[PDB]
């Protein structure tokens, strides 16, 4: 046996270290461990997409809850805030709902106010003055 692997222990250990926390023979038997570890790593890579997605649905759920406290629906809040030219993302709005409820009520008030301005503009077809909060800051 002119050449034979002397470092096989370490090669096994590289895979096995990731398998320690598994249950059953997967944690210790290399043949089984390697297969589960490949799956673990693949899942880990694909989970990044889901993490981002799940955070956003969580934020929307929380925003919905907080809006509903003020009698406003989720689409109403987000839509009207955008129309007020305020650009607050869903993460921050959810944070505000939890931690700054007075600020959130203010934002809910603003959204509601803008919503009524929209309805008044829609009802008042033709030549009518623009809503006070409806008017938009122009950038050039």
């Amino acid at each position: 046996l002119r050449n034979r692997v002397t470092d096989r222990y370490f090669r096994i250990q590289e895979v096995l270290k990731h398998a320690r926390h598994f249950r059953g023979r997967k944690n210790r038997c290399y043949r089984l461990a390697v297969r589960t570890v490949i799956r673990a790593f693949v899942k880990c890579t694909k989970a990044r997409y889901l993490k981002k997605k799940n955070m956003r649905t969580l934020w929307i759920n929380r925003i919905t809850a907080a809006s509903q406290e003020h009698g406003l629906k989720y689409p109403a809040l987000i839509g009207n805030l955008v129309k007020c030219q305020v650009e607050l993302n869903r993460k921050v709005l959810a944070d505000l709902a939890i931690y700054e409820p007075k600020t959130f009520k203010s934002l809910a008030a603003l959204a509601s106010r803008r919503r009524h301005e929209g309805f008044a503009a829609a009802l008042g077809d033709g030549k009518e003055p623009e809503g006070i909060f409806s008017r938009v800051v122009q950038y050039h």
Binding site: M55, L58, A94, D95, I98, Y99
Partner: protein, 166 residues
């Protein structure tokens, strides 16, 4: 083979200071190459795990298993050497701390089957290991009360945080 259990009685601790609680005496003893299954031996080892020396000897005396008398012999030897060599005050003032069976070196034989075919029979051997500690047997862990459960549950509720937020 390894024979570490024997070497455990060879440990010498430095002399204790006057302002120190008295160290309980520990005795390590084993029987090697018992012609008996380790799996069968396990039940008897488990039986006497928390017991005092006298309780254990009583239970073993009235047990019908082969391994019972072997453990009784080992326990008696351990009790004797505890008083003689390890400076235990009273032979009664001992309890089983550790009681274990391990595999022994085994022999392969042939078992003839009812054709040309056969099977490989294995002559089982086991080791019995015991550790005795000087002192009364420690009281068994009391069953969890309703108040303990209640407290634990409140603790769980109080521990919880707003997750995935600022």
């Amino acid at each position: 083979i390894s024979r570490k259990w024997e070497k455990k009685n060879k440990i010498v601790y430095p002399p204790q200071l006057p302002g120190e609680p008295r160290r309980p005496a520990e005795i390590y003893h084993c029987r090697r190459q018992i012609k008996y299954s380790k799996d069968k031996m396990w039940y008897l080892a488990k039986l006497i795990r928390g017991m005092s020396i006298d309780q254990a000897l009583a239970q073993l005396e009235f047990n019908d298993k082969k391994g019972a008398k072997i453990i009784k012999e080992v326990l008696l030897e351990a009790q004797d050497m505890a008083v003689r060599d390890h400076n235990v005050e009273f032979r009664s003032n001992l309890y089983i701390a550790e009681s274990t069976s391990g595999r022994g070196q085994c022999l392969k034989r042939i078992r003839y089957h009812g054709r040309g075919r056969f099977g490989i029979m294995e002559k089982v051997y086991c080791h019995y290991f015991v550790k005795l500690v000087e002192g009364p047997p420690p009281p068994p862990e009391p069953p969890k009360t309703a108040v303990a459960h209640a407290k634990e549950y409140i603790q769980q509720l109080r521990s919880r945080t707003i997750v995935h937020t600022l």
